[PDB]
Structure formats: C-alpha cells, structure tokens
Design a protein around this ligand. Sequence first.
Ligand SMILES: Cn1c(=O)c2c(ncn2[C@H]2CN(C(=O)c3cccc(CN)c3)C[C@H](O)C[C@]2(C)O)n(C)c1=O
Ligand SMILES: C[S@@+](CC[C@H](N)C(=O)[O-])C[C@H]1O[C@@H](n2cnc3c(N)ncnc32)[C@H](O)[C@@H]1O
Ligand SMILES: [Cl-]
Ligand SMILES: [Cl-]
Ligand SMILES: [Cl-]
Ligand SMILES: [Zn+2]
Ligand SMILES: [Zn+2]
Lengths: 301, 116
Amino acid sequence: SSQAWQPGVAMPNLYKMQRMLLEKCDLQNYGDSATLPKGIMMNVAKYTQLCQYLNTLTLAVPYNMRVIHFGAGSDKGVAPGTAVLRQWLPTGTLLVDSDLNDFVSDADSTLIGDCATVHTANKWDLIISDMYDPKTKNVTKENDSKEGFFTYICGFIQQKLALGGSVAIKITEHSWNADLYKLMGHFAWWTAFVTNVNASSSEAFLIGCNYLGKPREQIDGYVMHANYIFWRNTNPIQLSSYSLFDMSKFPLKLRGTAVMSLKEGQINDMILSLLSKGRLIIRENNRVVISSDVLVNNENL
Amino acid sequence: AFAVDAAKAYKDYLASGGQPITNCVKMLCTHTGTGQAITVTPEANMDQESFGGASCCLYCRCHIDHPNPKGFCDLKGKYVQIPTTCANDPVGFTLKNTVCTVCGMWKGYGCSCDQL
Ligand SMILES: Cn1c(=O)c2c(ncn2[C@H]2CN(C(=O)c3cccc(CN)c3)C[C@H](O)C[C@]2(C)O)n(C)c1=O
Ligand SMILES: C[S@@+](CC[C@H](N)C(=O)[O-])C[C@H]1O[C@@H](n2cnc3c(N)ncnc32)[C@H](O)[C@@H]1O
Ligand SMILES: [Cl-]
Ligand SMILES: [Cl-]
Ligand SMILES: [Cl-]
Ligand SMILES: [Zn+2]
Ligand SMILES: [Zn+2]
C-alpha cells in the first residue's frame, strides 16, 4: 500500500498518455466515508491533504506571495478551506477569497458575487478553486465539457497567473472543462490529485505546477478527462485520514523565490528553465487591488 | 444612545440553555504549540484546540459591527486556542475571557504572570 499514509493519490503518468473514451464513473467505495479525527470537518481534512500534496511539488513561494481562492464559502457561512490555506501559507501571505453567497472568512479580503464579477489589477502566484454546482451530478444526461465558472477560470489563469505560479482547480466526473485540461499543458507539470479522505468521490483537484504561459504540450481535454475517469474507474483508492495526524511538516516553506518583471522578448530558455523548476516568479510587484462589479437596478415604479 | 448588545444577548441565551454557536472551524495541528491565546498560525498545546479566528468571533458570525471604534477584529485572520474542555463553545469562550497582554496566554487558562 503506502498510499494510505500519503495525503492522497495523483494520476499516474501512464494514464495521462492514453486515448480513452469517456465512460460513467463507477467507484467501488462510493458512499463510504473516512473516519475523520474528532470534531474535524471534511473540508478542513480535504484542504489539509491538498496542501500536504502541494508540499511535494516545486511551488514558487516568494516574499509577499499572493493567493486567491474561489469557491471559498460553505453552506455553514464560514470558510474552512481558506482557514487551511492561511495556516499553510507563510505568515503575511496576501490571501483573497470569493464565493457567490455571503460568508465570514479569515482571508485578507473577501469578494461576494459570481466569480465573473471579480477583477484584479495584479497577477497571482497561486490560484485555488473549489467552485462546484452539485446540480451537475445528473446521471440521466450526456457528460459534456462545462462552461460557466470554468470559462472564467481559464481566462483568469491566462490573464492573471504569474509565470511560475501554480493552480489547483476542483473538478469531478461531471464538473469539468476541456480547455482547463488543455491549459494544464501550459505548465511545466500537471496532475489530477485525489484526496485520501474523499477517495470515494469522483472529485479531484487539477493541479498545474509552474505556469509557462505557452503550450509546453498539446492536450486534448475531452480525451484527458476520459483518461482521468478511466484511471479512477480502474484504481480504487482506499479511504484514509492517516496523514491528518502528522502536521509537523505542514507549513509551506518560505523559499524566498525571486520575483522579476519581464517582457515577452526576454523570456528565453534559461528563464523558462528557472520557471519550470519553481525558482522564478514573473509579474509586477505593485500593490494588490481587487474589485467586484455591482449591477445597479431600481425596482421601484 | 441605542446600540444592540450582542455579547449580553449571547450570554443570556447561553444561560437560558441555548445551544452554542456551531461550525467554528477547527484546525489540524501538532498540538505541541506555545499555547498562547490568539496567534498567526495554530499554536494549540496538548490541552487546547486551535480554530480559525473569524469563525469564533461573535461579531463576525452574527454580521454585526465590532465594538472596536475602528471596527477592527481581534480574531479574524488569526487562530484562537480554546481549552479542549471549552471547545464546545469557542465563541462563548472568546467572548467571556481575556488575553494577558504580557505573556499572551488566556487569563486563568495558562497565564501565570500573577504567580508568586
Ligand atoms: C452518482 N454516482 C454513483 O451513483 C456511483 C459512483 N460510483 C459508483 N456509483 C454507483 C452507486 N451505486 C449505489 O447503489 C448508490 C447510489 C447512490 C448513493 C449510494 C450511497 N451508498 C449508493 C451502485 C450502482 O449499481 C452503480 C453506480 C450508480 O454507478 N459515483 C462516482 C457517482 O458519482
Ligand atoms: C464545495 S463548495 C465551497 C466549499 C468551500 N471551499 C469550503 O472550504 O468549505 C462549492 C462552492 O462553489 C461556489 N460557487 C459555485 N459556483 C460559483 C460561481 N459561478 N461563481 C462563484 N462562486 C461559485 C458555491 O457558492 C459554493 O459555495
Ligand atoms: Cl491528450
Ligand atoms: Cl510576461
Ligand atoms: Cl450564528
Ligand atoms: Zn470578528
Ligand atoms: Zn500573563
């Protein structure tokens, strides 16, 4: 095994290389639940294992890091995931979160509204999304690439992710988007990461590690999603909460990664190599300013 | 001259037998930390639980103004350590208790400045 002591399981490279057709997701442990530590919420556990896995990758971690977290509100009116990110990230990290409905958060700033209403002047070092609409879990209709907030996320990445930065975007069997998988090939590396506490779900986090701003590899996202489902359909993951009990190495290490402003002409192979290794972030280092578009209407008559 | 007093309302609701505010965000941590009351990262010791601060602030959770004339929140964006024996009501605990400004521990739950 050993997998039960990891924070979760990443999609093996060989499955990414296949050309499967999309099938229905059938998980052998569907409906089962892991035994969480006393009084710990699923979303705390889930984000903790996500961050434990991210600790094994080459994330750029600059001074005055900037992180934005979409889909950060729960049905309880609080932000468990944001609380875990803030614990994980270096003290002082600029953390912004957002959701459709109102919620109380530990983030430095919180924007309430549809993600498409969110605008930011600055570029980001890390983008996290838990956005999800459970109405997509409809088995009676065809499973096509979804748009909606995924269209926003793809544009936000191409427009506001610093070179060198990373993303983790929540997907499921039915909540997925082909262009986002395609964008995974614009990173130095990528995977679909399943948490051991939620291994009985088709949920995964699509992680793009060290953004390069151009296609390093061409990915058909319809095929890749089929490949992801094929992996899940043929590789049961044992539910496990083991990694939650060892938090001694949890903090993300402040690597002091260098930040430079650079123009398209200066992005050469040396730079591209540093980006790909988690050793360089490219973006301005100005002040972080965000806003939320507000629609104005007068209903009186 | 009129201001709602939510602190007193929650205290009276608790005394009358009302159920404590739930869904305070409890963190995973080593529980080998300093034990200080309110910290920038979880610092629970063996006898505490650490929680996300905003979720333990009555004013944050009720969507009301903070008593600070600046409206600043003591807990938001930080972590609060609650004695495990009181972890069923973190909001009540933070409301009713005060932090020692010298050692940073909860008065009566770790502060020993008044010893000797
Ligand atoms: C929506 N959905 C699934 O529906 C699913 C699923 N993986 C396997 N399944 C099963 C579920 N089955 C049940 O009986 C069942 C149904 C509902 C709730 C529970 C809770 N115990 C169990 C057995 C069926 O014969 C085959 C089937 C439908 O595929 N995934 C990933 C998924 O998202
Ligand atoms: C699984 S939940 C959020 C859980 C949260 N991360 C936590 O830590 O508990 C899914 C969230 O996605 C948000 N969201 C979903 N669709 C959205 C959209 N188009 N725009 C903005 N937010 C959206 C929902 O309001 C909803 O709270
Ligand atoms: Cl492909
Ligand atoms: Cl650039
Ligand atoms: Cl409440
Ligand atoms: Zn508050
Ligand atoms: Zn003291």
